[PDB]
């Protein structure tokens, strides 16, 4: 009875050459369920326990319990420590500046110029931002627009200047307003039993301290589809007031990172592979003769929890030493905001009666409104530890840590500065590393293994001095030649890990033609730079076509599959004479192979399509593709480039008022685009009202039409009268 053991494959093929087999990415990624309050409280407790030995005080601005681990007692053990030493960080920054003379000055100049030429529109580049006016999560554009309108209500019109600097000036001025009046969204509950919630937009007002807390508030939720981790984690989103300055800080840190040879950011993909390979080759060639070179594949534990925004404030001040004071203050704002950051604990906890079969949602404001014996043991302990930092309104004071971790570039700079020391006490070791945001690969060259381990220990202690906690559990060391960095496995060269990109091989789910192109191009790129051979590439083509046909119900026209679409597909198959030209979506054959993965489907089959089918498919006025407006333009794409409305229906919630506001904005934008056809392509600039621009454009167009004779004299008179009344 022979027993198959898959791990015996490693007896033949080394782990790195078979690393793809160690990634179970054909399975469903873990998904979080229910509330994320438990994980948020866990991260708050971890941050404060890693910073508890620091100085605890009360903020006189918000009244929150602030903790300051910086300059605190040096850790006496290996637990995650946030007690970064300002002197050590400044020494590391000075060493990096000596290594890179003028790097800080150039980075500050570039960041300042970008900020001066950056517009408020840059704040719309976010997925979900904490909208303080509604105290919820709204798309970044929605949050920015609501903030701008609220600021207008408060006589804060810096956004109208069109630049990011005046809008951020308004942001920091709104903190000084004795009270903030804004547009909020409430809902009327009607019992029909069903409690239908009809939302409407109203006006609300809050005090100065409440607005300050909301601006400093970070809204927490649970991350979904995360892979490689047994337990779920929490994530956080900031507001406009914070992102505004985080943009500039991140840009400065990115300028610094781009000129550091040991930084894995912002480079990525093949550029990152080239940089890392060159760095590894250089560190291999720089090994002293007869010496021992050892690579430490190291991960940093509790990276965001232990990183302190005060240390990042110090880094910002040190970097922007030669900049004008206004830019220094601007860059300092973001670390200041993050040092007073408040964490919204989320949706609260659900309490249930099993015998009575009932459940209820206790929100975060009411978290302590019930005896703690009614929470489970873990939640009970979490609430007991959270109580000192808990805010009565339902939030937690999280002064230490970088929960969101929006300083990826600045944290990379800190890690590289840690790598820049390279030696302590003139000992017989020299370390140089590769530093992504938190993951790192150290390379210590010495005379023997003992001295290499001495150097690794010194690097560990130095990182502890900088607030960086190398993970002993996850970090390991071997002789130079094999290591892992950001899941890139180097074994005398970065091996190809085919499993990581495996989840993207399926139907991208945009539309039939778009998904066809996406799948073919994904196969092509995986062949190019993921080690997928021609046989596996052809098998991937076959599997993508199978999934595509089973997703869009467009099986082969001659096939026996039955469906609502398949009857018409079979009718088309019978009618068509050039069947080889029919698209896969229309039940046509798959003619894709390796050589033509880079050619779109219609282009590939354009000379094989029948004229009748080709004309029907490529009808310039087909109704399945959204047109622009008869005067409506010709939609060049085929009938398969259709759109399914992204219906965000919510049960027992009729968002008619929100839809009405959105459609009002949409109508205004559509009219503006009709007046300015270049608005879609090139962003229209100007400090003047949209109405003024539209009126002037229409007046000029009418005058030109009248002079050229396009418009009749009476029509010109009507146009002039309408414009005058406008």
């Amino acid at each position: 009875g022979m027993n198959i053991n898959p791990y015996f494959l490693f007896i033949d093929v080394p782990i790195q050459a078979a690393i793809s087999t160690t990634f179970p990415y054909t399975g469903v990624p873990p998904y979080s369920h229910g509330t994320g309050t438990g994980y948020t409280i866990d991260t708050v407790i971890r941050t404060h326990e890693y910073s508890n030995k620091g100085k605890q005080y009360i903020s006189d601005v918000t009244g929150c319990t602030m903790v300051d681990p910086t300059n605190g007692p040096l850790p006496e053990d290996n637990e995650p420590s946030a007690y970064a030493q300002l002197d050590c960080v400044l020494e590391a920054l000075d060493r990096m500046d000596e290594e890179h003379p003028g790097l800080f000055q150039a980075a500050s100049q570039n960041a300042m110029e970008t900020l001066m030429v950056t517009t408020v529109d840059k704040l719309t580049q976010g997925r979900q931002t904490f909208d303080w006016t509604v105290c919820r999560n709204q798309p970044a554009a929605t949050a920015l627009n609501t903030t701008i309108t609220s600021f207008r209500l408060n006589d804060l019109n810096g956004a109208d200047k069109g630049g990011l600097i005046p809008f951020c000036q308004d942001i920091i001025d709104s903190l000084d307003r004795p009270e903030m009046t804004f547009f909020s969204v409430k809902n009327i509950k009607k019992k029909l039993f069903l409690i239908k919630r009809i939302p409407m937009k109203v006006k609300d007002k809050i005090t100065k301290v409440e607005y300050i807390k909301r601006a400093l508030s970070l809204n927490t939720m649970t991350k979904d589809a995360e892979r490689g981790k047994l337990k779920r984690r929490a994530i956080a989103t900031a507001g406009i007031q914070i992102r505004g300055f985080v943009l500039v800080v991140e840009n400065l840190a990115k300028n610094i990172c781009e000129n550091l040879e040991q930084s894995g950011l912002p480079v990525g993909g093949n550029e990152k592979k080239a940089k890392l390979s060159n760095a590894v080759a250089k560190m291999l060639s720089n090994c002293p003769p007869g010496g021992i070179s050892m690579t430490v594949t190291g991960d940093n534990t509790k990276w965001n929890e232990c990183l302190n925004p005060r240390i990042f404030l110090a880094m910002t001040e040190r970097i922007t030493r030669d900049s004008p004071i206004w830019f220094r203050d601007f860059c300092s704002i973001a670390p200041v905001l993050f040092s007073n950051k408040i964490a919204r604990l989320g949706k609260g906890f659900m309490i249930t009666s099993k015998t009575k079969r009932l459940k209820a949602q206790i929100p975060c404001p009411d978290l302590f409104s019930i005896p703690l014996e009614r929470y489970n043991e873990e939640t009970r302990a979490k609430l007991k530890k959270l109580k000192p930092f808990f805010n009565e309104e339902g939030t937690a004071s999280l002064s230490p840590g970088m929960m969101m971790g929006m300083f990826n570039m600045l944290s990379t700079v800190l890690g590289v500065a840690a790598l820049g020391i390279k030696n302590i006490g003139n000992k017989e070791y020299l370390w140089d590393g590769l530093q992504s945001s938190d993951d790192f690969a150290l390379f210590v060259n010495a005379k023997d293994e003992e001295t290499c381990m001495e150097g690794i220990n010194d690097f560990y202690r130095t990182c502890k001095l900088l607030g960086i906690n190398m993970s002993k559990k996850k970090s390991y060391c071997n002789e130079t030649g094999m290591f892992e960095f950001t899941s890139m496995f180097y074994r005398d060269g970065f091996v190809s890990n085919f499993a990581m990109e495996l989840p993207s091989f399926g139907v991208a789910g945009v539309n039939e033609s778009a998904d066809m192109a996406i799948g073919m191009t994904i196969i092509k790129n995986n062949m190019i730079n993921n080690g997928m051979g021609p046989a596996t590439a052809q098998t991937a083509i076959q599997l993508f076509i199978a999934d595509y046909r089973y997703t869009y119900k467009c099986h082969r026209g001659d096939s026996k599959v039955e469906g609502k679409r398949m009857k018409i597909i079979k009718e088309l198959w019978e009618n068509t004479k050039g069947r080889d030209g029919l698209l896969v979506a229309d039940g046509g054959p798959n003619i894709y192979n390796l050589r033509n993965l880079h050619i779109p489907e219609i282009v590939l089959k354009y000379n094989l399509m029948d004229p009748e089918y080709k004309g029907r498919l490529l009808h310039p006025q087909n109704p399945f593709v959204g047109h622009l407006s008869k005067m409506d333009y010709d939609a060049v794409s085929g009938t398969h480039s259709w759109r399914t409305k992204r219906n965000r229906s919510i049960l027992n919630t009729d968002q008619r008022n929100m839809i009405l506001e959105e459609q009002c904005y949409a109508k205004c934008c559509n009219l503006f685009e009709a007046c300015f056809n270049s608005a879609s392509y090139r962003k229209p600039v100007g400090q003047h009202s949209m109405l003024e621009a539209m009126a002037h454009r229409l007046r000029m167009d009418a005058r030109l039409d009248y002079e050229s004779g396009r418009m009749s004299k009476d029509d010109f008179e009507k146009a002039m009268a309408h414009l005058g009344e406008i």
Partner: peptide, 27 residues
């Protein structure tokens, strides 16, 4: 600027002269 715009307007259904001053750059 005020004097220049006033002079331009004094100089000015179909006006002979269209005005390029007294308006934003883009317009």
């Amino acid at each position: 600027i005020c004097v220049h715009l006033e002079v331009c307007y004094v100089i000015s259904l179909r006006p002979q002269y269209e005005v390029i001053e007294g308006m934003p750059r883009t317009i």
